[PDB]
Write an enzyme that holds these catalytic residues in place. Sequence first.
Site, PDB file in Angstrom:
ATOM      1  CG  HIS A 254      -2.109  -0.827   1.180  1.00 28.27           C
ATOM      2  ND1 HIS A 254      -3.536  -1.333   1.672  1.00 28.27           N
ATOM      3  CD2 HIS A 254      -3.113  -1.147  -0.524  1.00 28.27           C
ATOM      4  CE1 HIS A 254      -3.659  -1.849   1.098  1.00 28.27           C
ATOM      5  NE2 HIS A 254      -3.863  -1.360   0.460  1.00 28.27           N
TER       6      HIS A 254
ATOM      7  CG  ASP B 137      -6.814  -7.346 -24.892  1.00 27.06           C
ATOM      8  OD1 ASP B 137      -6.250  -8.347 -24.499  1.00 27.06           O
ATOM      9  OD2 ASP B 137      -7.235  -6.713 -25.631  1.00 27.06           O
TER      10      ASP B 137
END
Length: 413
Positions: free
Chosen positions: A147, A360
């Site tokens: 984080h 993609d």
Amino acid sequence: INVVRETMVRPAGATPQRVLWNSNVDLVIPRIHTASVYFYRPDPGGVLREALAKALVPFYPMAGRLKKDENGRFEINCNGEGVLLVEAAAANASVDEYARDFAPDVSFQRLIPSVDYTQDIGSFPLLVLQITRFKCGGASLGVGMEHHVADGMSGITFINTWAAMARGEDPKIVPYIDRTLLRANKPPIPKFPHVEYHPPPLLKHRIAVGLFKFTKEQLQALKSQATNTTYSSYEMLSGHIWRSMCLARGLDDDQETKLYIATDGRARVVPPLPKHYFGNVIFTCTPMALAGDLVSRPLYYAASVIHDAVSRMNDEYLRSALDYLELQPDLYKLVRGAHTFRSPNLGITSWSRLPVYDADFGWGRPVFMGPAVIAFEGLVYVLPSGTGDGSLSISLGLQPEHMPRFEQLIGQI
């Protein structure tokens, strides 16, 4: 799961040897969790690796290591030591043998590296990536991020940049890497009480994971129950989940409940932060109400407390929090993961804005983008729709004897 290879991929070359200072909102975050799984299916290794190194030229803080300074304050030490990329293979296969209803569970934790944070921070990768292929074209991308380096949005930007490069294209993008913008003023001058970081209400004196679908022919209705003002579908859904959990847990009518909503401050800060700002801007927004007022009054009241709470977090309010957190006694104990989303409180993190289904690589786009495992009760993940339906899914953890109810009140809009 079998493993073919394990590579520590470092940038293609020419990366600064920075030590990134971190903004107060770069320090107050729930743990190092934020795991993610991407599921692919067939469509109409030697490239995924080099695309990662090529994408780690602009995003060199991902290839760095965690470090503390002399005050113990966390930094991002841009070592360039690398990011872990694993290429796994499954013999049994059958992606939906594996994912089934795509609901998070421990078997998703196996599409992700094991990694020990308990070890010294300066020698585990801030980000790990796994590519698990299956029987007839099923692929699974597991993402495990620290984080302290970047928020969810800045992390999805990297995965998209990595995917755009693997496609045989180019990134276009230069990231803005400077967390001194969100530096608190000297001296800190808070203008608000900031109840966001106040302790949560207590319940008046392992588990089961649940994935729930909201068609578009359900969200229509919520927009139909909206009144002075008129609220939005997400504000209704959120209050609907708030209302449902207050009834699923059988909360007494006079009990105070707290909803921890994460808020993106990239757009409401004046002047607006640069595009592709790399860091954590996630501010906390906590609407509150009595348990009875939520469930006895109409659904638009649950949006009233939610909408007016989010609309209060303007630039004057956000920068007042940065000044506020500068005065807190312990730096990371406002970090509250394992028992803050206890009953009667809850947390709702939404991804219905991050370009999630833009990863993609050449195998098509994701059929699934969601968390690996539900750690404990109380955190709601507002998933985004992949099939362009206009849908909206949620994943959730609750006590085993509150889920049978929660499923029954969620379905009734």
